[PDB]
Homo-oligomer: A and B are copies of this chain.
């Protein structure tokens, strides 16, 4: 009988439990992510502040449900306090110190086997969310951070600000179970896999022409980046980057795919990712 706690929204002042610093960990959509310290344990945590509204409360609740998943940033506690007379919602999460996804890759020969291990970890985050009827709708590398600078660090998905719930006899078809989109997550998965295997997006900028290339579905696997990469892997990208959402690959299908399913037993054929990624163009 495996039961976990419900979400408790703490009403007491956050400063009773945490030392809140002004150190900005990262600027983002909903605001500044601040570094804070647990008074009793002295561990570092991240703090995200939002104006308290039902939409805000809905997202936090989804993230809370999601926090059980190993590859989703864990919400440790949530407060509802009063800041400047405005009713605010303070969200405390595990501090991910290992940096963004692509930042780690460029700071080192990058193997294919390691790309697969990354894609498998990102996919488990989507699989969990989709299996509990949650669509992230903002899966991009800015929202994939490592827990520590350590090389055993686990990769974790963050920012549930666009997250949305997808819903309120053995022959009943999926359609009959009810109307639902989460295909955009899988599109995002395809873009991320593309950049991981090569080092640049499949749709660059010019800009109203980039809107076309997406709508049309026109992208290439140009050499010398892609020459050494298998037809199997290119096929997987192609099924992720399907223009029509109903044609596109589902998360269950993705995770069952050999390249993902066998992250252990997969070629180490070097990639140009680390090199190509190095082009900052400041």
Q: Is the CB of B15 within 8 A of A172?
A: no
Residues on B with C-beta less than 8 A from A12 are 5-6
Verify if A216 is at the interface (C-beta below 8 Å from B). Answer: yes
> Taking A20-B1, A68-B82, A203-B170 as contacts, is the C-beta distance between A177 and B214 under 8 angstroms?
yes
Q: What is the total number of copies of this protein in its complex?
A: 4
Verify if A130 is at the interface (C-beta below 8 Å from B). Answer: yes
- Which of chain B's residues has its CB closest to A211's CB? B177
Partner of A191, one of B81, B170, B214: B170
Q: CA of A68 to CA of B87 in the docked complex: distance in angstroms?
A: 13
Q: Contact string, A246-261, partner B, CB cutoff 8 A, digits 1/0?
A: 1100111100000000
Residues on B with C-beta less than 8 A from A8 are 11
Residues on B with C-beta less than 8 A from A208 are 51, 84, 86
In the assembled complex, the CB of A115 is this many whole angstroms from the nearest CB of chain B, namely 18
Verify if A164 is at the interface (C-beta below 8 Å from B). Answer: no
Given A3-B15, A6-B12: 7 more A-B contacts, CB < 8 Å? A5-B13, A6-B11, A6-B80, A84-B209, A132-B212, A171-B191, A244-B246
Q: Would you mind naming 7 contact pairs between A and B with Cβ atoms under 8 Å apart? A: A3-B20, A6-B82, A86-B132, A131-B212, A173-B214, A175-B245, A246-B246
